[PDB]
Every structure is written in C-alpha cells, then in structure tokens.
Amino acid sequence: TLQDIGVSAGINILSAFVFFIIFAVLRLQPFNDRVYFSKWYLKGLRSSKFLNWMPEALKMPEPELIDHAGLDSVVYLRIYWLGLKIFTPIAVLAWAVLVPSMRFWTHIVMAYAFTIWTCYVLMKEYETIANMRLQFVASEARRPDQFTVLVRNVPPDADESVSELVEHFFLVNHPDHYLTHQVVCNANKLADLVKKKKKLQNWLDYYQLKYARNNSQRIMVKLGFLGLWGQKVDAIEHYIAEIDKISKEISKEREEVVNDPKAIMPAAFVSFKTRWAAAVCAQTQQTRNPTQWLTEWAPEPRDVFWSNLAIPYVSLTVRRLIMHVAFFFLTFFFIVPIAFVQSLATFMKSVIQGFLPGIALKLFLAFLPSILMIMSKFEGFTSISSLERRAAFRYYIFNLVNVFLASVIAGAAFEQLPKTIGVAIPMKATFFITYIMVDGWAGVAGEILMLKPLIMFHLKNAFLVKTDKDREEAMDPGSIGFNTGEPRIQLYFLLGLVYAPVTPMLLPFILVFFALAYIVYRHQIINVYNQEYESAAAFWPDVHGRVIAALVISQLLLMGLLGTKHAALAAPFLIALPVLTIGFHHFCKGRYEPAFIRYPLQEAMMKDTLETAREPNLNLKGYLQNAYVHPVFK
Amino acid sequence: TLQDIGVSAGINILSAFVFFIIFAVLRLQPFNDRVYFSKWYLKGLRSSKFLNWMPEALKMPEPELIDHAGLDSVVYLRIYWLGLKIFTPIAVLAWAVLVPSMRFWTHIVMAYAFTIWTCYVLMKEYETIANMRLQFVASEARRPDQFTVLVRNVPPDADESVSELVEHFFLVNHPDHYLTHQVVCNANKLADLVKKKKKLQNWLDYYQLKYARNNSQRIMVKLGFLGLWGQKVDAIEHYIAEIDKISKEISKEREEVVNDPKAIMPAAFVSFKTRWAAAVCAQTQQTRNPTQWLTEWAPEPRDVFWSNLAIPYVSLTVRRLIMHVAFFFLTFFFIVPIAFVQSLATFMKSVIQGFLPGIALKLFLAFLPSILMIMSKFEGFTSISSLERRAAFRYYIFNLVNVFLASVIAGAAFEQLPKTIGVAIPMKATFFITYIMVDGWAGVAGEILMLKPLIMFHLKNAFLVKTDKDREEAMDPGSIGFNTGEPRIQLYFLLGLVYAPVTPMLLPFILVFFALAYIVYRHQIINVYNQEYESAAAFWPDVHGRVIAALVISQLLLMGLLGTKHAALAAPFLIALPVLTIGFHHFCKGRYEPAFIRYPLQEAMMKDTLETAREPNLNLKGYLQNAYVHPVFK
C-alpha cells in the first residue's frame, strides 16, 4: 500500500517537526533549563534559527565526549554508527541490483556479499571497541571496585562467623596482598522502613505546603472518593505521629540488625592492596568445590544492587527456572494483543489501517521493559549493570520470538483467508515499514522532548519544593536507558538483515532512523543523561553476539523462502553460510573477547606501578575499609 | 544367521583358549621372564592349574594399584568397569522386556530408562574420578612440572634476546615468585644426527657379532639382493668410518647449535618458587594481546615432545587446516576397503562369510592408529599426553563416521539388491556381533601374549646382546596404548547403546568383552606396561564427552528408526531426550570439570605449605635450573 506508506511517513514527519518546534520553544525558556540541561549541572558547570542544535551536537569529539559522559554512553552511541556502516552499502547495492532462475542466484550472491560485509564491519568495530576499553581502563582514575572482589557462598561453619572464616581463608591463601574485608549485611527490611519514612515525609510536606497556601480542611484519606474508613480532616498530626512511629521503628530495626547474627549473609567483599592481587583472585578457581568460595569482580558501590545480596545462593537455580517459566507464559499470552494489532492491520479506512497498528503496538510495548526489569530484579544479580544486560537480553528474546516471528506468521495466516508463506513473508513489508516509521522517527522525536521528566520536575516545583537547594534532588535525568535502546536497535538490525535481500524497500527507513537516533542521542549524551553505573562497555560482547544471531536468522529465513520455488538448488550454499558465520563469530570470540572478560596481569601491574609512583603515600586501607558498607549505614 | 554366529563364537573361544594355553606355557618358562614381567623389573623388585592368574589379578586393591602403576592406568582400567556398570542392567532389563503400537511406546520408555541409567552412572563415576584425581595430585611427590610453565609465542624484539625478554617480563609481572627460566632450543637436526648414529652403531654391532660368530664374507649392501651399487665384502671398516664421520658431524652440529641465535625459538619454560605462583601464572591472561605471552601448564620432562617445540606458533592454524583436509581424504578413501569387507559379508560359504569380515577388518585397521599418531605428531602438540588424546579423538571420529555409519549404510545398500533403512539397520546385528566377537574376545586373548614384543626381545638377545646390563635397555614394554584402547571401547559403548533398544542380542557379547578386557588389562597393569607419562587422568573429560555423544547419537538413530512406521508419534519425546542429555552434560561440566581443567589455589597453597614444612632446606633453584634443558644436552 504505497499510499498508506506515504501518508504514514508524511504524518510522522509532521509529528517530528512539531516535536522539534516544541523542543526549540522549551529550550530557550529559562526555567526548564534545570531539566533540559541536567548534565553541565550535575557536573557543576552552569547555573540559572532553532534547529542549529543538530550541527552543534557534532562538536566535542570522542575523547572529550568519553571523559564527559562515560565509555558506556560512547559505545552505545557508536552502536547507531555501526548500524549506518552496515546498512548504507547494503542498501545502495540492493537498490542498484533490484532496479535496472537468474533471480535466485542473484539473491544468493547478494546474501553472500551482505554477510561478508556485515562480518567485516563487525570485526573492525569489535577490535576498535576492545582497544577503546583497554585504553580507558588503563587511564581510569582510582575506584574501590578495582581492588575489591565479591566472594559468594562462603561455606557455613558451626563455630566460626562469616567474617572470621573469610579473614582466615584469605590470610592463608593470599598472603601479603589481602588488606581488608567487609561482610554483606541483610538490611532489606531496614531499607524498606527508610523508604516508607521518606514517602511519608514527602506526603507530609505536600500536605503542609497545601495547607500553608490555602487554609481549609482536607478529608481525603489517601484516595479522596473511597479512601480509608476515617475522616482525617487535618491529618497533619496524623502524619507527624506516623513519622515519629516510623522513626522509632527504624531505630529499633537498626539496633536489631547491627547485632543480629542471622542478618549475616554467607558472602563478603574482599579488598587487596594491589590490582594485580585482585585480578589474580578474580580469575582463578579458589577451592576444590566449584560451588564454594565463588569469586567474581565486585561492582562499584553505586552499582551494587544491595537488595539482592540477601538472596541465598542455593535458590538461584530455582529462581532462574521460575524466570524461564514466567517468561514462557508472558511470551505466550502476548501474541493475543499483537494478534489483535495484526487484525487491525486488515479511503476512510486506508489511513487508519496504515497508521494505527504502529501506535497501538508502541503503547502495547510501553510497560514491557518495566516488566522485564522487575522480573530480573526479582531474581538476583547484585549489580545494576548485570540487571540491565539480562533485561535487555530477555527483551531481545521476546522481541525476536513474538513481534517479528509471531507477528509475521499471524499476519500471513490472516492473509491466507499448501504453504504460501513464501509469498506471504515479504508482504508484511508494509506493516513493518509502518511500525519502524512510527517507533523510529516519531518515537525518537517525541523522546527528545522529555515530556514526562519535565512534567514531573514542574510538579515537584509546584507542590514539593519548599525552599532552595532541593531542586538539585528534584532533578533526576535518568540513565541512558540501555535496557530499552539496545533491544530496539537489535530488532531493527535483525529485521533489516532479514528483509534486505527480499524487500529492499525496507532499508532506506532503517538508515534514516539510524541517522536520526544517532543525532538525537548524541545531543542527549552531551547535555543530559548522567550514567548510573560506569562499566567498561562490558555489554559489547552481548551486542555482537546478538548481531551475529540476527545474521544467522536472516540466512535461515532466506534459505526457507528461496526453498519454496522449484529448481532452487540454494541449499548447498545457504547451509554453508551459517557455518561460515558461526566460525567467524568463534574466531572473533577467541581473538578479542578476552579483552572484555579477562583482566591482563601486565596491565594490572602497570596501572599499579603508575599509581603508586604518582601517590607514594596513599592510605589504601583507610580508603577501602569504610566503603562497600551499605547505603543505609551512611 | 544364528549358525554363523555360533560357529564364530565357538572358533573364537577355541582361539582364546589356545592363546591362554600358550601364555601359560610361556609364563612358566624362565628366560622370557624379562618380557613377561617388565614391571617388577623397571621398579627393581625381581631378578632371574594354569589359569589361576585370573583370580590372582584381582588382589592388590586400588591404593596399591595406583601407587604401583599410575592413576592414568587405574582410570583407564576403570573405564571397563564403567562399561560393565552401564551395560549390565540395560542388558538384563532389555532381555526381560523383549522375551516374555505397544511395541513403539515400549521401546520409547526403554530408551528413557536406558538414558537415565547411563546418565546417573556417568555422573557418579565422574565425581569419583574427580575425587581420585584431586587426592592423587595432593599426595603426589615433587615433580618439576608442578613449578614450571610453558610460555608460547614471545613477541620478537629487534635488540632483546628471547631470554632477556622473558627474564625482564616475568621479573616485572611476577615479583618475589619467579625463580628461573629455560629457553626452548631448536635441536631437531642434532637429535636426528644422534638417532642416525645410534642406528649405525647398532648395525655395526650386529655385523661385528655376526662375523665373530662366523668368519665369512658378507656382501649385502643394506638389501642383499638389489642393494647399493657396491660390494662391501667386509663393510666393518665402512661402518667404523661412518661412525667416525657421524661423530665429527654431531660435534660440529653441537658447536653450531650452542652459539646460533637462529636456533632459539620464541618460547621458554618458566619456573616459580611456589606452586601457588605457578598456578596463578598458568590460568590468567598475561597481556593485552591474547596471542602473545600465551601460557599453559608445562608437561614433565619425560613427557615433553621436544621435536615439536621448534614449530613456529603462527603456522599451527595452517597445520590444523591441513590436518582436517587430510583426515577428510583418509575417511573418504577408507570406505572402499570397508565396502569390500561388507561385500565379503554377503554350507562351505556360510562359515567363511560369517567369520572372514571381522578378521579382514581387524587387519585393515591395524596400522590406522599408527597413521593417526603420525599425523598428530606431524602437527605439533609438544606433549605425548596431548598427542595421545588428540590421536584418540581423531580415531574415535573416524571410527564413528566410517566403520559404524558408513559400514551400516553400505551394507544396507548391498542388502537392498522407498527407504527400507528402518528394517535394514538392525539386520547388521549379525555382522557387528562377528566383528565385536573377533576384535574383542579373541583380540584381547591374543593381545595378552605379547607375541611381537617377545619376538623382538628374543631377536635382540640373539643378534644384538653382546654383554650383560644391556638387556635392561633391550626391554621396552611400551605404554598402556591409550590411543588404541580408548577409541575401541568408545566404539563398543556407542554401538551397544545404539542397538540396545532395537537388537538386544548385541548386549551379552559386549558385557563379556568388557569383563575379559577388564581382567586381562588388570593383569597387564599389574605386571607389565610401565607408563610413559604421568597425567592426572586429564582425559576423563574427553571420555565422558564421547560417551555423551554416543548417547545422543543413539537417541537420534532411535528417532530415525522409529519414525518410519506409520502412526509413530515418537518425535515429541525423542526430540526432548537429546535436550535432556545435553543439559545433563552441561551440568556435569560446570559441576566437576573444573577439578580437571583448573588448579585450585587453596590446594596449591596447602601442598606448598606441607612440602616446605617437610623439607625446610630444599634447593628448588638448583633442582629446577638444570632440568627442562633437552634430552640431547644430557
């Protein structure tokens, strides 16, 4: 439906242009500078015709950008550039070869060329990212996570405490290098009490400001219409009593958890004097039993997800099983809404049938990242970085399984009123153009506005800000949103690769999305989006593996589609291609991924020598002993 | 052909009984005690009605056997016991359920039971072997390989020698623990010259003894009939001149190789003061580049295959490619002889058609282990242990690909004068019974005789022994022959598992072979077969993986055979079984194989502490500096 594609593209262009106009209007206004310039503010740099921001964003090259934002941000930004590099020549060559049995062999050779080019680009980008990571890790300033190691599943003892066991074991095994240790404490209940106190205090402050502004009687018990079985005409004394009671409860809980042995988990953080010793401990089997004294790199304190360190290790297998079962139920139940979207995708009906499915799907997938993050958070990983990577991986799996595969198969079933899938599969190019268009150009254009953060910030100013110096706390830009950005771009990679040799009409809009996302997210990295955690792009192996998986899937679907026409004879080549791709992936693994999953001892020793030369009087023990304790215990 | 099976079994029983009679006659004779008791002689214990040796072999339980022979020998022996444990209940249950659409489901449930039992037995034996290995490594006496690490692919430098580079790098990276290092030297030419000298000296000694015994003229120039274009009527002066010339050449080559920089390979052996430091170095990435300063455990000096350390590392990929190509050519050419054997496997013809194929195949596979060992030796591995493991792995691959799969398919093709493979595959139970029978019972029975070593030893006594104290050198029992024993038993495992649920007539002869091989090889381990190298059963992961692969193959062939009958409906279970098996293998991997592929630092430190307590005055540097040099340089 060329007319539907055209009208959808036009309306999305108008939406994007309107979004950019609104952004320009808001940016020049002075009182939302706090939210539109969250960075340059958290870094302590600023206080207190229109579309020139796009070329202004290209300044400040890679080194300054890295030091300003973070290598995670820079690599995530480079993912879009990688997409452009992969899909520009593929698109131009495909268009040139489709616009002036030979058809089949032509497609086969085109697939060979596309796979070769994608592999070469992936290899070069992989090497570049590995070099950047090694350089950044070498140049990085001192952090407590470079000397600290998380020991899991300390074997229980009848008489020895966990602290005594860890101290004795590490003194025996790592002499002259073990410095200090901290024991994981189970303070989830205390943290929950403190969070409840904070919420109640915020509610009290809101009510106090409201009564100060207007002297009346408010009798809404937490709901207004059908609230609590009470009156609470004033409720200020009620909230004061609540605050006092919660403070006493929190003090009692602090006292209990300080001296309760039952709150000691069988895990601890160990800190060494040298990065070399830490790296040695973090990469070697510790004991006969490969399930005791388990060792892994310790996340930096702002990254450690303290709420999950209380999960006993023995139940993680049960948990992962529950994860897979629940994910199966989710991915099975979630065809029905997307089947409904396909049903909607059957002149007054033409425009709506061409536009509505995309926006409907976008609303339907709005809370899905939140659900997946909740699920992963439920089953412990002890680090926000690992939680985000796992959530992105699950979102990619669901993405592939349902919104591409299940969507296309259901749509073909609807189109069918033998196996006409061979002619059916390319026909959903129209629907995918629509969905990519709306969830790409217009989606990013609306994304730059930060409508929700802006509304939230103004609401805090209107009803919660009582004095100064609290707007700093009210400002909270949020993370880059890896959990959402990575799987969406992976879907686009996969879908463009799959339909590249069959429906080249796809590729131009993929390229446009890649460019627009690159520019907008570069502006975002420059001016907003302070990072929550500083990993050294540890997710790049996952991203590369996902791209290779998409490539294999594209090859297999090409084999399936081309295997329907008689006298195909494409099997003896389309079965060889996946083997070549897997071999290339294995070579890249063995040739580079060590730079991401292992820490070279020469690098560790060089870093240590340079640091000890620069600061020969560094009190490492004092620097490390009071860290890694808990957010609650200050 | 029940009559052919019976006559083959009978004739093989007569052959085995005759072999045992001959063994009894030879054992009581005193002058072949040297060869029939090679052990108890290399260990320095002995000097200078019939079938009671079978129960005498059961004495001397596992600890004494381990200390007497080696844990490699003990584990290899236990492989047969594992076979008995797997195939006794399977055989009895299969016979009970086959001898008094239901047929299909009965077979499916039987397959489930067999897979479950095999997995449980494999898991228990895996755990037991891991415990035995850890205990033996802890209790092991001092060896130079526990402190030494082989560094491969040292990056070249314009001005620094390899020794200088290694010394500087390891002093920088592993302070307070690096002790000494030795540089790999390329003396392959010198070793070849020395071997030629030894051969010429042996020939000279033979001729001298011959002329001393009989004073005549011998004019055979190395061939007798069509020898060299010469006379050599006496040739004693000729051989003396040859010895003198080769001695001068060897002296010159020694002088050249001592001072030639070009003979220094980019590799070296590094020795540390502590097992802990050695283990740390042997398990961690050393530098940014994962192809420089490559590190692995160093084999003990009698195990190091010095002839291959001269191979530049950069050509190993090319070599492995040539390996795979040559192995493909071999496995493709080698159907023709086995196809001929199947052709031979079509009353005067009944006996020969029932017996000849087995013995023909046994002769046809006689030199195959030698060829595979030559190939692996050609492409470097630097250790006899790794060479044997790789050769066994390739022999298992060829074994599976050809003599089971290709043999059965060719035989079915011959039987076929659609797809009658469903009825064809079980029908070669007859041929496999014959081959197992002959290459099992009679094969082992002839194996115990040591006919070839005995003939060789008597020939040395007759023509090479000139004085005393040289019979010790003339005695050479040989290794356990892992390269041959492991793949044959793996074939039997695979074949018994595959035909267990379809042709239970197979299993009894497998069980009998397992028992007879166990007893004979136990006697061999007790009295002969000094080990060449002492590994800590590092091959058990390979053996277990091979058994799991055989299990998967058996499940897949069961699915294929049962998928031919109409209304099978066995796919939804026979596709689930391989997934369960792979999952179980992954769990066993992650739960035990670390004990084989990694060295726990607590164990290393405990061993070190005990040793330094027992010997507080051990000159480790003096113990290690002169080791690991070369066999040639004494």
The CATH number of the domain where A306 resides is what?
Answer: 3.30.70.330
Q: Which long-range contacts (CB under 8 A, 24 or more apart) does B603-606 make?
A: B603/A287, B603/A288, B603/B134, B603/B137, B603/B138, B604/B274, B604/B275, B604/B276, B604/B278, B604/B279, B605/A172, B605/A173, B605/B275, B605/B276, B606/B138
**Is residue B528 one of the residues assigned to a domain?**
yes
Q: Report which residue type is found at B255.
A: E
Hey, is the C-beta of A172 within 8 angstroms of any chain B C-beta? yes
SS3 B266: strand
Q: Point out the residue among A284, A591, A605 whose CB comes nearest to the CB of B173.
A: A605
Taking the CA of residue A65 and the nearest CA in chain B, the distance in Å comes to 24
Can you list the positions of beta strands (E) in A455-598? none
DSSP state letters, B378-423: HS--SBHHHHHHHHHHHHHHHIIIIIIIIHHHHHHHHHT---THHH
Taking the CA of residue A273 and the nearest CA in chain B, the distance in Å comes to 15
Q: Residue B221 corresponds to which tokens in the numbers above?
A: 């120039």
Residue A263: how many CB atoms within 10 A of its CB?
18
Residue A628 sits at φ, ψ, to 5 deg, of 60, 30
Q: What angle do CA A574, A578, A582 make, to 5 degrees?
A: 165
CB contact under 8 A, A288 and B595: yes
A268 and A173 co-located in one domain: yes
Taking the CA of residue A285 and the nearest CA in chain B, the distance in Å comes to 5
Element holding B151 (H helix, E strand): strand B148-152
Q: Quick one: which of A119, A50, A38 has its CA closest to A85?
A: A119
Q: Which residue has the tokens 């079985």?
A: A229
B398 and B489 co-located in one domain: yes
Q: Report which residue type is found at B197.
A: K
Cα(B622)–Cα(B625) distance, integer angstroms:
6
Q: Is B63 exposed, middle or buried (0-12, 13-18, 19+ CB in 10 A)?
A: exposed
Task: Compute the residue count for chain B.
Answer: 634
**Is residue A610 one of the residues assigned to a domain?**
no
Q: Is A345 exposed, middle or buried (0-12, 13-18, 19+ CB in 10 A)?
A: buried
Q: Is residue A485 within 8 Å of residue A80, measured between CB atoms? A: no
Q: Quick one: which of A547, A557, A558 has its CA closest to A120?
A: A547
Q: Is residue B436 within 8 Å of residue B492, measured between CB atoms? A: yes
Q: Quick one: which of A447, A257, A410 has its CA closest to A334?
A: A410
Dihedral sign of CA atoms B325, B327, B333, B335 in order: negative
Q: Quick one: which of A200, A205, A198 has its CA closest to A242?
A: A200
Hey, is the C-beta of B393 within 8 angstroms of any chain A C-beta? no
Which residues from chain B sit within 8 angstroms of residue A291, using beta carbons?
A: 591
Cα A469 to chain centroid distance, Å, stands at 31
B351 and B427 co-located in one domain: yes
Q: What angle do CA B350, B355, B356 make, to 5 degrees?
A: 105
Structural domain including A54 reads: 2-47+49-140+314-601+616-624
A268 and A255 co-located in one domain: no
Q: Residue B350 corresponds to which tokens in the numbers above?
A: 């009944």
Q: Is residue A65 within 8 Å of residue A74, measured between CB atoms? A: yes
Taking the CA of residue A143 and the nearest CA in chain B, the distance in Å comes to 21
> What is the per-residue burial (b if ≥16 Cβ within 10 Å, else e) of A171-180?
eebbeeebbb
CB contact under 8 A, B284 and A284: yes
Secondary structure (H, E, C), B43-60? CCCCCCCCCCHHHHHCCC
Hey, is the C-beta of B595 within 8 angstroms of any chain A C-beta? yes
CB contact under 8 A, A601 and B134: no
Element holding B257 (H helix, E strand): helix B236-259
Q: Is B348 exposed, middle or buried (0-12, 13-18, 19+ CB in 10 A)?
A: exposed
The strand order across the sheet containing A148-152 reads: A178-185, A264-272, A148-152, A294-297
Pairing, β A178-185 against β A148-152: unpaired
What residues are paired with A181 via a beta bridge?
A: A270
What are the counts of helices (DSSP H) followed by strands (DSSP E) for chain A? Answer: 29, 4
**Is residue A608 one of the residues assigned to a domain?**
no
B57 and B174 co-located in one domain: no
Alpha helices by DSSP H, listed for A283-406, are: 316-333, 335-344, 348-364, 368-378, 384-398
Q: Is residue B630 within 8 Å of residue B306, measured between CB atoms? A: yes
A248 and A281 co-located in one domain: no
**Is residue B171 one of the residues assigned to a domain?**
yes
Cα(A448)–Cα(A452) distance, integer angstroms:
11
Secondary structure (H, E, C), B487-515? HHHHHHHHHHHHHCCCCCCCHHHHHHHHH
Hey, is the C-beta of A291 within 8 angstroms of any chain B C-beta? yes
Taking the CA of residue A549 and the nearest CA in chain B, the distance in Å comes to 20
Hey, is the C-beta of A139 within 8 angstroms of any chain B C-beta? no
Q: Point out the residue among B284, B601, B603 whose CB comes nearest to the CB of A601.
A: B284
Hey, is the C-beta of B594 within 8 angstroms of any chain A C-beta? yes
Which residues from chain B sit within 8 angstroms of residue A134, using beta carbons?
A: 288
**Is residue A606 one of the residues assigned to a domain?**
no
Resolution in A: 3.6
Q: Point out the residue among B173, B291, B592 whose CB comes nearest to the CB of A601.
A: B173
Q: At what angle do helices B384-398 and B368-378 cross, to 10 degrees?
A: 130
Hey, is the C-beta of B350 within 8 angstroms of any chain A C-beta? no
Q: Is residue B563 within 8 Å of residue B556, measured between CB atoms? A: no
Cα(B76)–Cα(B318) distance, integer angstroms:
33
Q: Residue A376 corresponds to which tokens in the numbers above?
A: 């992963």
CB contact under 8 A, A134 and B287: no
Taking the CA of residue A605 and the nearest CA in chain B, the distance in Å comes to 6
Hey, is the C-beta of B284 within 8 angstroms of any chain A C-beta? yes
CB contact under 8 A, A173 and B590: no
Q: Residue B511 corresponds to which tokens in the numbers above?
A: 């069980």
Which residue in chain B has the smallest CA separation from A138?
A: B288
Residue B265 sits at φ, ψ, to 5 deg, of -75, 160
A295 and A319 co-located in one domain: no
B236 and B282 co-located in one domain: no
Secondary structure (H, E, C), B317-367? HHHHHHHHHHHHHHHHHCHHHHHHHHHHCCCHHHHHHHHHHHHHHHHHCCC
CB contact under 8 A, B591 and A285: no
Which A residues in the span 396-425 are in contact with B, Cβ-Cβ below 8 Å? none
CB contact under 8 A, B288 and A600: yes
Q: Residue B70 corresponds to which tokens in the numbers above?
A: 């080696």
Pairing, β A294-297 against β A264-272: unpaired
B241 and B302 co-located in one domain: no
Which residue in chain A has the smallest CA separation from B134?
A: A288
**Is residue A206 one of the residues assigned to a domain?**
yes
Q: Report which residue type is found at A60.
A: M
B434 and B512 co-located in one domain: yes
Hey, is the C-beta of B591 within 8 angstroms of any chain A C-beta? yes
Which residues from chain B sit within 8 angstroms of residue A589, using beta carbons?
A: none
Q: Quick one: which of A599, A170, A167 has its CA closest to B605?
A: A170
**Is residue B625 one of the residues assigned to a domain?**
no
CB contact under 8 A, B286 and A173: no
Question: Residue B149 gets which letter from DSSP?
Answer: E
Cα(A369)–Cα(A334) distance, integer angstroms:
14
Q: Quick one: which of B315, B330, B439, B319 has its CA closest to B394?
A: B330
Q: Residue B296 corresponds to which tokens in the numbers above?
A: 């692995």
Q: Which residue has the tokens 């099997």?
A: A571
Taking the CA of residue A68 and the nearest CA in chain B, the distance in Å comes to 26
Which residue in chain A has the smallest CA separation from B291?
A: A591
SS3 B150: strand
Cα(A435)–Cα(A362) distance, integer angstroms:
8
Which residues from chain A sit within 8 angstroms of residue B598, using beta carbons?
A: 284-285
Task: Compute the residue count for chain A.
Answer: 634
B408 and B446 co-located in one domain: yes
Q: Residue A557 corresponds to which tokens in the numbers above?
A: 């679907």
Taking the CA of residue A172 and the nearest CA in chain B, the distance in Å comes to 8
**Is residue B617 one of the residues assigned to a domain?**
no
Hey, is the C-beta of A588 within 8 angstroms of any chain B C-beta? no
Q: Residue A286 corresponds to which tokens in the numbers above?
A: 């510790």
Q: What angle do CA A418, A424, A430 make, to 5 degrees?
A: 165
Taking the CA of residue A78 and the nearest CA in chain B, the distance in Å comes to 23
Q: Residue B492 corresponds to which tokens in the numbers above?
A: 């039997």
CA dihedral A395, A397, A398, A401 (to 10 degrees): 160
A356 and A299 co-located in one domain: no
User: Which of B132, B176, B288, B317 would best serve as a mutation to test chain A binding (most A beta carbons within 10 A)?
Assistant: B288
CB contact under 8 A, B288 and A603: yes
User: Which of A285, A579, A609 would best serve as a mutation to test chain B binding (most B beta carbons within 10 A)?
Assistant: A285
Cα B418 to chain centroid distance, Å, stands at 43
CB contact under 8 A, B600 and A279: no
CB contact under 8 A, B600 and A285: yes
Cα(A614)–Cα(A616) distance, integer angstroms:
6
Domains identified in chain B, total number: 3
**B464 Cβ partners below 8 Å, 6+ apart?**
B202, B205, B206, B209, B470, B474
Domain boundary among A291, A311, A331: A311
Cα(A537)–Cα(A75) distance, integer angstroms:
7
CB contact under 8 A, B280 and A279: no
Cα(B160)–Cα(B172) distance, integer angstroms:
16
